[PDB]
Design a protein around this ligand. Structure first.
Ligand SMILES: *[C@@H]1O[C@H](CO)[C@@H](O[C@@H]2O[C@H](CO)[C@@H](O[C@@H]3O[C@H](CO)[C@@H](O)[C@H](O[C@H]4O[C@H](CO)[C@@H](O)[C@H](O)[C@@H]4O)[C@@H]3O)[C@H](O)[C@H]2NC(C)=O)[C@H](O)[C@H]1NC(C)=O
Ligand SMILES: *[C@@H]1O[C@H](CO)[C@@H](O[C@@H]2O[C@H](CO)[C@@H](O)[C@H](O)[C@H]2NC(C)=O)[C@H](O)[C@H]1NC(C)=O
Ligand SMILES: *[C@@H]1O[C@H](CO)[C@@H](O)[C@H](O)[C@H]1NC(C)=O
Ligand SMILES: *[C@@H]1O[C@H](CO)[C@@H](O)[C@H](O)[C@H]1NC(C)=O
Ligand SMILES: [Zn+2]
Lengths: 352, 182
């Protein structure tokens, strides 16, 4: 049964990690990019985890498929569209999607990624294609969709462009800047290229979220809020290791993008503990339920709601209010945030 | 200024083969073979490019700029089925799904700072049929006004009659300027 069969809101999901096996498989054959399988279904297994491995083995899954997609215009605009559909197939009524535009380009890229040759597709045009792939999904599948452009932790060089793209494509669906990749790289959060980008984000009105606290000290979180000035937090588990900061964060109403099924599988949550979330629920904190990389997790957004309802006795009353929260914390103009809430309040049945 | 063109990839389109006999001087019959997709077989695939003939080099290979199909078209087989220039810097394209009851029009503008073609999705125009296929044999061609902000096009009305409809580049509906039993 559809664990929570009402409208939902999703804020933390990577395009990178929400692709269709079938369409990876298609571009593999078309481009002659070698692939570790031939069934669509056999492939979801080789790419997917069900044993909760670790962040090295997780990032290794990207290498199986990404060479087939990146640098290929036809493919990008597609997955962006196909993505919106899979969101509509879950409860979702509004999504924010993140990806790194550099990770999909093959021309004009600092270290040209995925060991692919030069080089026709510039990152500026990847972003452009994506928008259009999403616009065409929003229209067709009937879920409002905005995008978040990722900076990459190990690449402060890029992060300047990222914010600049965020700026020019603010009309075409990009609403925020993220920073993913690797927390545990020493003093990443302070790299001049990164922080100056986030400075320009604040300066230019570009909203801000940061991957932090997932597998990394509470201090990574501190850095993100303080110098980076993040409005929202990706994952953010191990912020419960500093009760001062944690309680001042609840005070200042910080939003926590939570990825339950993700945590289990990344190993960022050791299963002996209560999940970082049950506490968040009990502390009445501002948080949302997300899926992260549903392709690699072999998951739908229902998997993350199934988990919290079963494993940790989440009620529909809770599910309702965290989605209200997600909507409140969303990076929409004031404007549409009002009507997103309206849609939500009406569906549920509370005062609007 | 610009030369647009289509590119067709027939790699996996099967071949029809038949004998050709020629003048009786030809001792062994020639086998003609032709990429030709019979019903339900593998079709060609298409791509679309525009090149600027004014900035041609003779020291550099020409930059051809691709305009991808709409995403709705990309999820399966499709066709490029009409191209019609609208202004000096605006080009309109019509795509059609292999199941020929759904088609999409793109309207693309030259982008000075990028040097590629922007196809505003806001400017798309979906066209479809529930009772059959789109167009008499294909989607009809648009005729634009001089400034290229609006165009006329023959589309079937709801009584089922083909009449001239009047479109605004970004407004999603159109106005019939003729009706009747003809
Ligand atoms: C017309 O459409 C067809 C699609 O059928 C297409 O022909 C295909 O071209 C792709 C792209 O080149 C071919 O794949 C290549 O095959 C060769 C030799 O077998 C490979 O060496 C190529 O280079 C790769 O080699 C390694 C692969 O792991 C790596 O070194 C690296 O990743 C290289 O990319 C590449 O695999 C493919 O064989 C055909 N498809 C078939 C099966 O017919 C053609 O490209 C299209 N033409 C145009 C203009 O679009
Ligand atoms: C034909 O149309 C083209 C496309 O608009 C014109 O080319 C532009 O010329 C003006 C200069 O007057 C510039 O603003 C643009 O940069 C040009 N576009 C480019 C880069 O091709 C042209 O004026 C027209 N007439 C000609 C040259 O025959
Ligand atoms: C242009 O392209 C062809 C084929 O890719 C190549 O052989 C030729 O050397 C190129 N010319 C220049 C000027 O680089
Ligand atoms: C197109 O026609 C086919 C056959 O009747 C049918 O599968 C489908 O509903 C139609 N699709 C659209 C979008 O009209
Ligand atoms: Zn993430």
């Amino acid at each position: 049964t559809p664990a929570f069969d009402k409208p939902k809101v999703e804020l933390h999901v990577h395009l990178d990690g929400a692709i269709k096996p079938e369409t990876i498989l298609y571009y593999g054959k078309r481009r002659g990019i070698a692939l570790p399988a031939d069934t669509p279904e056999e492939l979801l297994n080789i790419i997917g985890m069900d044993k909760p491995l670790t962040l090295p083995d997780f990032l290794a899954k990207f290498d199986y498929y990404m060479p087939a997609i990146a640098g290929c215009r036809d493919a990008i605009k597609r997955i962006a569209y196909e993505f919106v559909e899979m969101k509509a197939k879950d409860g979702v009524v509004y999504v924010e999607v993140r990806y790194s535009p550099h990770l999909l380009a093959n021309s004009k890229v600092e270290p040209i990624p995925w060991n692919q040759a030069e080089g026709d597709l510039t990152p500026d045009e990847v972003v452009s294609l994506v928008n259009q792939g999403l616009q065409e999904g929003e229209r067709d599948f009937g879920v409002k969709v905005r995008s978040i452009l990722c900076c990459m932790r190990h690449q402060p060089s890029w992060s300047s462009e990222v914010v600049e793209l965020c700026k020019k494509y603010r009309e075409q669906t990009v609403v925020a800047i993220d920073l993913a990749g690797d927390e545990t790289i020493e003093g990443s959060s302070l790299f001049p290229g990164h922080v100056q980008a986030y400075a320009e984000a604040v300066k230019s009105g570009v909203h801000r979220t940061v991957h932090a606290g997932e597998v990394g000290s509470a201090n990574v979180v501190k850095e993100a809020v303080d110098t980076l000035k993040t409005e929202r937090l990706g994952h953010g588990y191990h912020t419960l290791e500093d009760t001062t900061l944690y309680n001042r964060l609840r005070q200042e109403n910080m939003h926590f993008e939570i990825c339950p099924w993700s945590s289990y599988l990344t190993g960022a949550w050791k299963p002996d503990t209560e999940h970082a979330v049950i506490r968040f629920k009990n502390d009445q904190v501002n948080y949302s339920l997300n899926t992260d990389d549903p392709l690699i997790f072999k998951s739908t957004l229902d998997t993350d709601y199934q988990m919290t309802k079963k494993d940790m006795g989440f009620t529909e009353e809770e599910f309702k209010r965290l989605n209200i929260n997600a909507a409140k914390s969303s990076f929409l103009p004031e404007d549409e945030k009002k009507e997103l809430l309206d849609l939500l309040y009406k569906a549920y049945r509370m005062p609007s | 200024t610009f030369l647009a063109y289509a590119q067709f990839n027939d790699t996996e389109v099967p071949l029809i083969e038949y004998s050709f006999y020629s003048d009786e001087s030809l001792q062994y019959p020639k086998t003609v073979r032709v990429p030709y997709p019979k019903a339900g077989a593998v079709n060609p695939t298409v791509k679309f490019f525009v090149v600027n003939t004014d900035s041609l080099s003779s020291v550099t290979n020409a930059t051809s700029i691709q305009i991808t199909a709409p995403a709705s078209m990309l999820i399966g087989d499709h066709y490029l089925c009409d191209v019609t220039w609208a202004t000096q810097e605006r080009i309109s394209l019509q795509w059609l799904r292999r199941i020929q009851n759904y088609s999409v029009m793109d309207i693309c503008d030259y982008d000075e700072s990028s040097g590629r073609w922007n196809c505003l999705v806001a400017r798309q125009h979906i066209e479809m049929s529930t009772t059959g296929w789109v167009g008499r044999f294909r989607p009809s061609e648009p005729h634009f006004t001089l400034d290229g902000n609006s165009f006329y096009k023959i589309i079937s009305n709801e009584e089922g009659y083909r009449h001239i409809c009047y479109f605004q580049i970004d407004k999603k509906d159109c106005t019939f300027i003729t009706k009747g039993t003809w």
